[PDB]
RNA sequence: CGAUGUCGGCUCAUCACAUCCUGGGGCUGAAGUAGGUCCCAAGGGUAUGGCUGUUCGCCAUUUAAAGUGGUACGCGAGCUGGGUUUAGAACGUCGUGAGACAGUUCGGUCCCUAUCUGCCGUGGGCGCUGGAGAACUGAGGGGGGCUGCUCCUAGUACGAGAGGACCGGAGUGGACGCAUCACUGGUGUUCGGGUUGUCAUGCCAAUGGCACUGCCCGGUAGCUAAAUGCGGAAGAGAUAAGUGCUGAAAGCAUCUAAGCACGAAACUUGCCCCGAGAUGAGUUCUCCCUGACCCUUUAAGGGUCCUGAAGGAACGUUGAAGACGACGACGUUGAUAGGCCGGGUGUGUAAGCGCAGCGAUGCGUUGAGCUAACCGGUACUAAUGAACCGUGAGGCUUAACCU
RNA sequence: AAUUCCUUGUCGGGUAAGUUCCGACCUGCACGAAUGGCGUAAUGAUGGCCAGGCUGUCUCCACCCGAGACUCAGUGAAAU
RNA sequence: ACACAGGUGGUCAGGUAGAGAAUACCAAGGCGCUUGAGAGAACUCGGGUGAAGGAACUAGGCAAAAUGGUGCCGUAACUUC
RNA sequence: AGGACCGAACCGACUAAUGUUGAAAAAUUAGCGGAUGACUUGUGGCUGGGGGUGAAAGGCCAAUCAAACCGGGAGAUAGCU
C-alpha cells in the first residue's frame, strides 16, 4: 500500500538504490498505489556510475509490495520489501537493462510487457 | 456491540471475577445451597456445572484439573468422593435457581441457588 | 415479477472451472403459497399476498387462523405482498416454487440489516475524528460545529448527527445469480445481502435493466 | 489574561 | 447550561407525570400454603409450587 | 448450519495431503497466460495452515533469487493442482512468523524423522 | 462598555451565480485536434505537500477542476492558542528620566452538570366513534445524480503532410455511499502454550496468586477495513438558451401573432428509504361478544347483580434487538437460555508411567490433553395452575336497497 | 544580526519544493569596544534547524480491557 | 470550614533476587479506602494491541513508541590538556 | 579531591493529561531537575508599614502588598450611577 513519503527499494539496474514516492497518479485525492500503478518518485541514494543521480525526479512503477496482489482465487502474494522500476519520465520506458527479483503476473500489458521481458521469475 | 457475545461482566475486572467465581463455587459445593444475586447465580451455573461434569470420572489428572480450577483440597475431596457418584445417572442440570424476593439493603434481585439432591 | 421470501442462511463460495472463486450467499427460499389475491374490484390495484414456513397452533391467533382457513392454506409465519405487474395472475393458494427465478439472470434483495444500535457520528455518517493530540481536550470524536451563527439561528432540518444505526430495511440491486437449486429449496446470489443469518430476505427480480 | 479580552 | 427563566408548576407537573409507578397486577396464590407471593418467586416462608425448598 | 456444509462437502476435493506446519512442500499451480495454460512449480515452507473445511488455506514461504515471497493457497480450489511434500519438518510452534523475520542459518529448521 | 470573546488551523457545513469541471447552444480570423468570446445551467464534484503564526502568496507534483462569494471577515456554552494584546527579559531607536514603538526576539491558566427553541433518535397518553390482529394504497418528506483512461468505430471523415474527430458500442480505474465477513487481515485482558521473579497448596513432581493480560507467542465467535459485492442509469414528460416547418399581419420577407415539432447532468417522474396523528386520521381480510333489572334531571342517561369473549398487558427463559422503554422468539401439545453428548475450531505431543542419560533434557503412551462466543441434537435444570385489563351487537338525518 | 524597515535583499548549501536554519557580500532605517567588542572546550527541564531510530501523531481509524455515562434502591446539591 | 486523594520532625527496619532504604513478591502487623445492584449504547477519562506506510499530522515529533544492566573491545572534530 | 558523575530519601516544580459548582481557594497521575552542598530541615530568637526583607520579580511580609491588618478621624468627598 504505497502512498506518498514511502521509501521504496529499486528493482532494476537503473543506478538508483533507494527512492521515495512523492505522488500517486491518476485521479484526485487518490490515496495509495497497487502493483500495476505508476507513481512519481525522487531519488535519495544512488551508485555514482548510475544513469540517474541523487536528487532527480521521475516516474516509476511499483512491482512488489508487502501488502501483495490478490489473485481471483483468493490467493495473495506478499513479498518482503516494496520495490519499484524506474521509468523514462515522459516516455515511460524503463532505464536499466536488467531487473532483479521476481514480479507479479497481473502487470502484463505492453509497456509492462517490456518490463516482464527482462524479469527473471513470475 | 456484543452480537453473539456471552459472559457477564458484573462490574468487576477479570481477575476479581475469576477469583470471585472460585470463592462462590467453593461455598456452593461445600454448603450445597446458597443465596446470592441473580446474574451472579446464572454465571455461577456457567462456572460450577463443568466441575461436577469433571467429577464424574475419578482419576488423578482430573483431580489435578479440579485443584487447578477451584484451588482447595477439602472441596475436591468432597466433590470427587460424594458429588461424583451422586450425580452419576443424569446428564446436565446440576444447579437449580429459585428467585427469593429482593435484598433489603440495596434492592438487589436475590436468588437461592442449590444443588439438586438435598 | 413476483418476489420470493426466504431465509438468509450463511455465506459460502463456489468455484468455477476456470478459476474465479465467486463468494455467494445461500437463501433458503421455501416455496411460498399465496393466501390473498387483490384486484381492481375492491382495491383499484392488483397484488398477491404470500406466506411461508410453519407456526405452532398455540402461537397463532383466531384472526390469522380465520384468514388462513379462508382459502385452503396452512399457517405460515409472517405475511408479505407483491405487486403483480400487469399481465400475471394466480388462483388463491397456488404455490410458487423457485423456477420463475430459474428463468431470470439479474436479481435484487431487500431485507432488514444488522442493528449497530446507538452509534456515534464516526460510525454512522463517516465523519472525521479530530486530532488525537496537540493539546486536544475532551473532544476527540464529537462532531463539532452543527450550525453557522445568529443569522440562521437554528440547526437545519436533516443535520447529520449521532443516533440509531442499523435495524432498518435496505436493499442490494442487480446481484448476479449463480445457481438455483430446485430440490433443496435454495437460491445462491453473488456477494453480500443484508441481515444476520436467519433473516427474512424478500427477493425480487431486479428493476434496473 | 488577554485572549478573551478585547484590546 | 444555566436555565433561562424558571418554568411553572405545569411544566414541572407534565414532566413528573411520567414517573407514575405502576403496581404488580396480582399476586399468585400458592397451592399448598395459600399465601401470596410474586409470580416465579418463592414465598416468604419458603414454599414454591408446592415444594418446601428452603426449610 | 447443515445446508452450507452440505454444499461445501460437495465442493471439496478428496485427496488433500495433510502436513504439519514446517514441512518443505512442492506446490504446483495452474497458470493461465490467455489462450495457453501451464503447470508451474513453487517450492517453499508452509508457515501457517487454517482449516475451515472448504475455506482451508495454507501459506507457503519461498525465498527466490534474493527475495522472500510468501504466498497463500486455497486448499480445495481447482486452481492448485497437486500438493507434494518434499521433507517433513520438526518445529513445534503452530505458526511460523519468525521465518518471515529471520534469514539464513536461523531460518533453517529441523527434520522430523518422528 | 452592570461585557455581543479577536486572526489562523481542525471537525461540520448550508446557500447564491457574477460557473472552475462535467451538460446544452450561437459566432469564430472554427479545415481536424485544441482553443477564443458570449447565452442557458447550481444536479453533482472541487488537490497533496515545502516555507510562513499566517488568510494570501511563491514553488514542486497531480487533476476532469484545484470556482468566486455570503453565512457575527460561519463555526472557541465544539477543539487548538502559533500570532496579536497583561505582568518577566532583551536588541535597535526615541527620551535628561520613569518608560515607549502597525519594529523584532524568547516565555506566558481557554470556565460551564443544557431550562426553552432547534436537530438526531426512541417511547407513554389519547385519538381515529363496538373492540381486536394483520397486510397494503399513497398525500407528503428524504436519499442518490461526480467522472477518467483504454479499446472498437479508424487511423475514417479532415488536411500539403505533420497530426486526427463529432455520433455510437464495450471494458476497466479513481473519489464517494450502502451492505456483509465468504476470502486477506486487525482486535480477540473469557481459549491453548512458552517464560523470569516471588509466594502458597507440608514436601519432589504438578498447579494457582501477584508483578500493566507480568512479558510474550498463536487464535474461535463477534465487531471491523486496508477486504469483498453493489449504486450513479436507461426510458418518459413540460422546458431554459438554441435550431426549426408552414404562415399572414406588412402581395414580399419572418420560429409566432393563430398553430405544429425537436431541444440540457436543471424541474417532474423512473431507483431507494420514511410515510394514514394524511384530525382529510384511508382501504381489504379475519376474529370476538345476541343477560337481567331499577331509578329519575326519559337521557348519546346514572346505578345494581350475572357474565368477562377476541386479544393485550404483567411475569419467567431470552435474542447477531437493545441506554431504558421498544421490537423479535419462546412458556412443558415446549429446544427460549443454561448444562450434557457428537462434531467443528484453536493451541501444539498434557499429566501419570516406563525407558535412555550423572544431570538439564529427550523419546514411547500421543496429534495426546484442554478447548470462549461455533454447529447439530438432547427436556437434565429454569420457563407454574391461574389471577389483571378489555364486556355484553355498537347514535342521528337523508338517500338507495331488499323484504 | 535577540538589532535589517524596504525584505521572503542577492549568491551558495540543505529539500521534490525552504518567508525558518547554515556560509557569504555590505547598500549598518538605527552594531561597535567594561550601559563592553569579538571568540570560546564544558555545561543548559534554554532558543532555531537537520538527519538516523522509533512509533495510531497522521493517511484512516478498528477492536478490546477497566472507571463514569444509562436503569433500579437510599441520601440529595449549585450557578440561574 | 468536611470522617477533605494535600502538608507534618525523630527512633526500629526482617526473607528471596538485588549494588541499594529503588523495585517484584512476602513475614510480623494492619486493612479492603461508609453507597450497592444490574446493563455492557454514544461520549469522555486510564490503559492494551494493530495490517501496509513511517512525521505525510503539526505552531513544533507535543504526547506516545523505542533505547535501558554487567564485563570486555572500540571511540572523532574540537579543547582551557 | 570535587559548588564532580548516575541514582532513592529529602527539596523542588520543566512537560502533557485529568481537574475548573475539584478529592484540593494550586492538587493528582506519567515522565523531569538538584541530591556533600551557594544544600535541606526541627526547635528558639530578631528586623515592621513609607518600614522590614530581597542571588532583584516591584516579589514576600498569616490564602490580602506600586505600601499589611485592626480600630479611630468618618455619616471623608463624589459635578458620577
Ligand atoms: C478557575 C475558574 C475561573 O475562571 C477561569 O479561570 C476562566 C478560565 C477565565 O478565563 C481566563 C482565561 C482567558 C484567556 O479567557 C478564558 C482570560 O482572558 C480571562 C481573563 O481569564 C474566565 C472565563 C474569565 O472570563 C473572561 O473574562 C474576560 C475579561 C472577558 C471574557 N468574556 C468577555 C468573553 C470572559 O470570558 C474570568 C474573568 O476569570 C471569569 C470571572 C467570572 C472570574 O474571575 C472567576 C472568578 C474565574 O476566575 C473562575 C470562574 O474562578
Amino acid at each position: 500500500m504505497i502512498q506518498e513519503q514511502t521509501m521504496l527499494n529499486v528493482a532494476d539496474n537503473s543506478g538508483a538504490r533507494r527512492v521515495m514516492c512523492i505522488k500517486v497518479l491518476g485521479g484526485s485525492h487518490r490515496r495509495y498505489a497497487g502493483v500495476g500503478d505508476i507513481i512519481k518518485i525522487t531519488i535519495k541514494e544512488a551508485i555514482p556510475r548510475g544513469k540517474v543521480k541523487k536528487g532527480d525526479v521521475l516516474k516509476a512503477v511499483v512491482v512488489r509490495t508487502k501488502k501483495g496482489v490478490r489473485r481471483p482465487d483468493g490467493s495473495v502474494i506478499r513479498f518482503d520489501g516494496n520495490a519499484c522500476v524506474l521509468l523514462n519520465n515522459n516516455s515511460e520506458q524503463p532505464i536499466g537493462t536488467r531487473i532483479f527479483g521476481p514480479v507479479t503476473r497481473e502487470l502484463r500489458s505492453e509497456k509492462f510487457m517490456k518490463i516482464i521481458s527482462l524479469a527473471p521469475e513470475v | 456491540m456484543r452480537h453473539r457475545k456471552s459472559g457477564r461482566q458484573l462490574n468487576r475486572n477479570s481477575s476479581h471475577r475469576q477469583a470471585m467465581f472460585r470463592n462462590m463455587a467453593g461455598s456452593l459445593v461445600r454448603h450445597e445451597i446458597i443465596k446470592t444475586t441473580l446474574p451472579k447465580a446464572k454465571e455461577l451455573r456457567r462456572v460450577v456445572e463443568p466441575l461436577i461434569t469433571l467429577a464424574k470420572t475419578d482419576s488423578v489428572a482430573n483431580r489435578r484439573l479440579a485443584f487447578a480450577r477451584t484451588r482447595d483440597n477439602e472441596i475436591v475431596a468432597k466433590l470427587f468422593n460424594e458429588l461424583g457418584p451422586r450425580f452419576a445417572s443424569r446428564a446436565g442440570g446440576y444447579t437449580r435457581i429459585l428467585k427469593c424476593g429482593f435484598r433489603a439493603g440495596d434492592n438487589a434481585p436475590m436468588a437461592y441457588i442449590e444443588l439438586v439432591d438435598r | 415479477m413476483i418476489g420470493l421470501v426466504g431465509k438468509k442462511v450463511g455465506m459460502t463460495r463456489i468455484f468455477t472451472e476456470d478459476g474465479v472463486s465467486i463468494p455467494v450467499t445461500v437463501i433458503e427460499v421455501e416455496a411460498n403459497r399465496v393466501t390473498q389475491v387483490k384486484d381492481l374490484a375492491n382495491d383499484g390495484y392488483r397484488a398477491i399476498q404470500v406466506t411461508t414456513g410453519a407456526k405452532k397452533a398455540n402461537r397463532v391467533t383466531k384472526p390469522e387462523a380465520g384468514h388462513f382457513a379462508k382459502a385452503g392454506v396452512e399457517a405460515g409465519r409472517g405475511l408479505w405482498e407483491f405487486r403483480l405487474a400487469e399481465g400475471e395472475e394466480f388462483t388463491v393458494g397456488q404455490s410458487i416454487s423457485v423456477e420463475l427465478f430459474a428463468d431470470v439472470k439479474k436479481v435484487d434483495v431487500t431485507g432488514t440489516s444488522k442493528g449497530k444500535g446507538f452509534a456515534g457520528t464516526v460510525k454512522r455518517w463517516n465523519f472525521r475524528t479530530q486530532d488525537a493530540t496537540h493539546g486536544n481536550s475532551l473532544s476527540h470524536r464529537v462532531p463539532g460545529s452543527i450550525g453557522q451563527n445568529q443569522t440562521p439561528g437554528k440547526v437545519f432540518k436533516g443535520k447529520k448527527m449521532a443516533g440509531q444505526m442499523g435495524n432498518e430495511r435496505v436493499t442490494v440491486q442487480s446481484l448476479d445469480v449463480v445457481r438455483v437449486d430446485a430440490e433443496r429449496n435454495l437460491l445462491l446470489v453473488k456477494g453480500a445481502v443484508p441481515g444476520a443469518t436467519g433473516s427474512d430476505l424478500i427477493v425480487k427480480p431486479a428493476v434496473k435493466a | 489574561m488577554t485572549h478573551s479580552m478585547r484590546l | 447550561a444555566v436555565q433561562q427563566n424558571k418554568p411553572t408548576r405545569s411544566k414541572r407537573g407534565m414532566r413528573r407525570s411520567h414517573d407514575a409507578l405502576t403496581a404488580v397486577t396480582s399476586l399468585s396464590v400458592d397451592k399448598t400454603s395459600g399465601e401470596k407471593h410474586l409470580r416465579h418467586h418463592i414465598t416468604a416462608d419458603g414454599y414454591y409450587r408446592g415444594r418446601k425448598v428452603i426449610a | 448450519s447443515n445446508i452450507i456444509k452440505q454444499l461445501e462437502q460437495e465442493q471439496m476435493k478428496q485427496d488433500v495431503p495433510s502436513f504439519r506446519p514446517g514441512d518443505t512442500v512442492e506446490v504446483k499451480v495452474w497458470v493461465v497466460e490467455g489462450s495457453k495454460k501451464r503447470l508451474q512449480a513453487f517450492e517453499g515452507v508452509v508457515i501457517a495452515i487454517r482449516n475451515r473445511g472448504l475455506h482451508s488455506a495454507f501459506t507457503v514461504r519461498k525465498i527466490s533469487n534474493g527475495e522472500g515471497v510468501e504466498r497463500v493457497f486455497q486448499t480445495h480450489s481447482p486452481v492448485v493442482d497437486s500438493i507434494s511434500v518434499k521433507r517433513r519438518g520438526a518445529v513445534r510452534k503452530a505458526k511460523l512468523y519468525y521465518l518471515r523475520e529471520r534469514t539464513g542459518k536461523a531460518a533453517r529448521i529441523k527434520e522430523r524423522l518422528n
Side-chain angles (χ1 to χ4, degrees), chain C residues 155-173:
Chain C
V155 179
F156 279 87
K157 195 171 299 154
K159 193 61 173 44
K160 318 219 177 90
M161 270 178 200
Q164 172 61 258
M165 178 189 185
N167 205 29
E168 260 289 357
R169 164 178 159 205
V170 78
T171 180
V172 194
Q173 284 183 336

mmCIF file of all heavy atoms in Angstrom, chain C residues 155-173:
data_model
loop_
_atom_site.group_PDB
_atom_site.id
_atom_site.type_symbol
_atom_site.label_atom_id
_atom_site.label_comp_id
_atom_site.label_asym_id
_atom_site.label_seq_id
_atom_site.Cartn_x
_atom_site.Cartn_y
_atom_site.Cartn_z
ATOM 1 N N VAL C 155 -30.517 24.943 14.016
ATOM 2 C CA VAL C 155 -29.963 23.805 13.312
ATOM 3 C C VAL C 155 -30.915 23.437 12.191
ATOM 4 O O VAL C 155 -32.126 23.325 12.406
ATOM 5 C CB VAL C 155 -29.753 22.633 14.278
ATOM 6 C CG1 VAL C 155 -29.218 21.459 13.544
ATOM 7 C CG2 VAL C 155 -28.795 23.020 15.345
ATOM 8 N N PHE C 156 -30.383 23.292 10.982
ATOM 9 C CA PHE C 156 -31.195 22.957 9.824
ATOM 10 C C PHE C 156 -31.806 21.574 9.980
ATOM 11 O O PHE C 156 -31.264 20.713 10.675
ATOM 12 C CB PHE C 156 -30.356 22.991 8.555
ATOM 13 C CG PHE C 156 -30.161 24.351 8.002
ATOM 14 C CD1 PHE C 156 -29.129 25.139 8.445
ATOM 15 C CD2 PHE C 156 -31.006 24.840 7.034
ATOM 16 C CE1 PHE C 156 -28.944 26.388 7.936
ATOM 17 C CE2 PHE C 156 -30.823 26.089 6.521
ATOM 18 C CZ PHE C 156 -29.793 26.864 6.974
ATOM 19 N N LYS C 157 -32.952 21.369 9.343
ATOM 20 C CA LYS C 157 -33.578 20.060 9.401
ATOM 21 C C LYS C 157 -32.802 19.080 8.538
ATOM 22 O O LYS C 157 -32.389 19.403 7.427
ATOM 23 C CB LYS C 157 -35.032 20.131 8.954
ATOM 24 C CG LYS C 157 -35.816 18.895 9.344
ATOM 25 C CD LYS C 157 -37.301 19.036 9.097
ATOM 26 C CE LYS C 157 -37.880 20.176 9.899
ATOM 27 N NZ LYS C 157 -39.109 20.755 9.304
ATOM 28 N N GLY C 158 -32.595 17.881 9.059
ATOM 29 C CA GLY C 158 -31.757 16.926 8.379
ATOM 30 C C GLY C 158 -30.280 17.072 8.652
ATOM 31 O O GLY C 158 -29.470 16.751 7.777
ATOM 32 N N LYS C 159 -29.900 17.568 9.821
ATOM 33 C CA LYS C 159 -28.497 17.583 10.196
ATOM 34 C C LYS C 159 -28.018 16.162 10.441
ATOM 35 O O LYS C 159 -28.730 15.344 11.020
ATOM 36 C CB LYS C 159 -28.295 18.434 11.443
ATOM 37 C CG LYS C 159 -26.855 18.766 11.745
ATOM 38 C CD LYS C 159 -26.238 19.555 10.615
ATOM 39 C CE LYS C 159 -24.854 20.033 10.967
ATOM 40 N NZ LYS C 159 -24.068 18.960 11.608
ATOM 41 N N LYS C 160 -26.820 15.856 9.970
ATOM 42 C CA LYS C 160 -26.231 14.552 10.219
ATOM 43 C C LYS C 160 -25.678 14.533 11.634
ATOM 44 O O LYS C 160 -24.704 15.227 11.932
ATOM 45 C CB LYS C 160 -25.135 14.252 9.204
ATOM 46 C CG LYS C 160 -25.471 14.648 7.775
ATOM 47 C CD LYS C 160 -24.968 13.618 6.773
ATOM 48 C CE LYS C 160 -25.367 13.974 5.349
ATOM 49 N NZ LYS C 160 -24.361 14.827 4.666
ATOM 50 N N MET C 161 -26.300 13.746 12.503
ATOM 51 C CA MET C 161 -25.897 13.648 13.893
ATOM 52 C C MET C 161 -25.829 12.186 14.282
ATOM 53 O O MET C 161 -26.111 11.297 13.482
ATOM 54 C CB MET C 161 -26.869 14.356 14.824
ATOM 55 C CG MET C 161 -26.577 15.797 15.083
ATOM 56 S SD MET C 161 -27.850 16.467 16.152
ATOM 57 C CE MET C 161 -27.665 18.199 15.816
ATOM 58 N N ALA C 162 -25.468 11.946 15.533
ATOM 59 C CA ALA C 162 -25.400 10.583 16.025
ATOM 60 C C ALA C 162 -26.796 10.084 16.342
ATOM 61 O O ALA C 162 -27.736 10.865 16.482
ATOM 62 C CB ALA C 162 -24.519 10.511 17.267
ATOM 63 N N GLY C 163 -26.942 8.769 16.452
ATOM 64 C CA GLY C 163 -28.266 8.229 16.688
ATOM 65 C C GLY C 163 -28.321 6.760 16.341
ATOM 66 O O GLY C 163 -27.309 6.072 16.374
ATOM 67 N N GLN C 164 -29.521 6.296 16.022
ATOM 68 C CA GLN C 164 -29.715 4.894 15.688
ATOM 69 C C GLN C 164 -29.054 4.560 14.363
ATOM 70 O O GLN C 164 -29.255 5.251 13.365
ATOM 71 C CB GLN C 164 -31.198 4.573 15.608
ATOM 72 C CG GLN C 164 -31.494 3.211 15.080
ATOM 73 C CD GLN C 164 -30.913 2.157 15.955
ATOM 74 O OE1 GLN C 164 -29.883 1.580 15.641
ATOM 75 N NE2 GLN C 164 -31.561 1.900 17.073
ATOM 76 N N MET C 165 -28.258 3.502 14.355
ATOM 77 C CA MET C 165 -27.656 2.991 13.141
ATOM 78 C C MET C 165 -27.980 1.518 13.025
ATOM 79 O O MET C 165 -27.633 0.731 13.914
ATOM 80 C CB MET C 165 -26.151 3.179 13.130
ATOM 81 C CG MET C 165 -25.535 2.603 11.888
ATOM 82 S SD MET C 165 -23.749 2.553 11.910
ATOM 83 C CE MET C 165 -23.450 1.961 10.253
ATOM 84 N N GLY C 166 -28.635 1.157 11.934
ATOM 85 C CA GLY C 166 -28.964 -0.216 11.678
ATOM 86 C C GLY C 166 -30.406 -0.529 12.013
ATOM 87 O O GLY C 166 -31.203 0.342 12.364
ATOM 88 N N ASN C 167 -30.723 -1.825 11.902
ATOM 89 C CA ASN C 167 -32.068 -2.382 12.070
ATOM 90 C C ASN C 167 -33.084 -1.699 11.164
ATOM 91 O O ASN C 167 -34.238 -1.500 11.535
ATOM 92 C CB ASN C 167 -32.526 -2.333 13.525
ATOM 93 C CG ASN C 167 -33.553 -3.387 13.837
ATOM 94 O OD1 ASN C 167 -33.564 -4.452 13.226
ATOM 95 N ND2 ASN C 167 -34.435 -3.093 14.780
ATOM 96 N N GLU C 168 -32.658 -1.327 9.967
ATOM 97 C CA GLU C 168 -33.577 -0.744 9.012
ATOM 98 C C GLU C 168 -33.607 -1.620 7.777
ATOM 99 O O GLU C 168 -32.697 -2.417 7.542
ATOM 100 C CB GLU C 168 -33.201 0.691 8.623
ATOM 101 C CG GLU C 168 -33.991 1.792 9.339
ATOM 102 C CD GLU C 168 -35.457 1.923 8.908
ATOM 103 O OE1 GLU C 168 -35.916 1.211 7.991
ATOM 104 O OE2 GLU C 168 -36.166 2.766 9.502
ATOM 105 N N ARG C 169 -34.670 -1.475 7.000
ATOM 106 C CA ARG C 169 -34.779 -2.232 5.769
ATOM 107 C C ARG C 169 -33.961 -1.558 4.683
ATOM 108 O O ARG C 169 -34.076 -0.354 4.457
ATOM 109 C CB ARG C 169 -36.237 -2.339 5.356
ATOM 110 C CG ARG C 169 -36.418 -2.753 3.939
ATOM 111 C CD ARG C 169 -37.853 -2.890 3.593
ATOM 112 N NE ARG C 169 -38.003 -2.797 2.158
ATOM 113 C CZ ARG C 169 -39.116 -2.412 1.557
ATOM 114 N NH1 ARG C 169 -40.177 -2.087 2.278
ATOM 115 N NH2 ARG C 169 -39.164 -2.349 0.236
ATOM 116 N N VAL C 170 -33.108 -2.331 4.024
ATOM 117 C CA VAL C 170 -32.236 -1.798 2.992
ATOM 118 C C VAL C 170 -32.085 -2.868 1.921
ATOM 119 O O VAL C 170 -32.414 -4.038 2.135
ATOM 120 C CB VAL C 170 -30.882 -1.366 3.592
ATOM 121 C CG1 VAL C 170 -29.999 -2.562 3.846
ATOM 122 C CG2 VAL C 170 -30.201 -0.274 2.763
ATOM 123 N N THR C 171 -31.600 -2.461 0.755
ATOM 124 C CA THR C 171 -31.649 -3.285 -0.439
ATOM 125 C C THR C 171 -30.309 -3.312 -1.157
ATOM 126 O O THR C 171 -29.496 -2.393 -1.030
ATOM 127 C CB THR C 171 -32.721 -2.777 -1.390
ATOM 128 O OG1 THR C 171 -32.749 -3.602 -2.555
ATOM 129 C CG2 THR C 171 -32.457 -1.364 -1.788
ATOM 130 N N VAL C 172 -30.075 -4.401 -1.879
ATOM 131 C CA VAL C 172 -28.965 -4.532 -2.813
ATOM 132 C C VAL C 172 -29.563 -4.827 -4.176
ATOM 133 O O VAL C 172 -30.435 -5.692 -4.298
ATOM 134 C CB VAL C 172 -27.991 -5.647 -2.397
ATOM 135 C CG1 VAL C 172 -26.711 -5.534 -3.180
ATOM 136 C CG2 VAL C 172 -27.691 -5.585 -0.922
ATOM 137 N N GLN C 173 -29.102 -4.118 -5.197
ATOM 138 C CA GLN C 173 -29.699 -4.213 -6.519
ATOM 139 C C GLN C 173 -28.751 -4.857 -7.520
ATOM 140 O O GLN C 173 -27.533 -4.665 -7.459
ATOM 141 C CB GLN C 173 -30.113 -2.837 -7.030
ATOM 142 C CG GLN C 173 -31.368 -2.322 -6.399
ATOM 143 C CD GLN C 173 -31.785 -0.995 -6.967
ATOM 144 O OE1 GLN C 173 -30.965 -0.247 -7.494
ATOM 145 N NE2 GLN C 173 -33.069 -0.688 -6.863
#
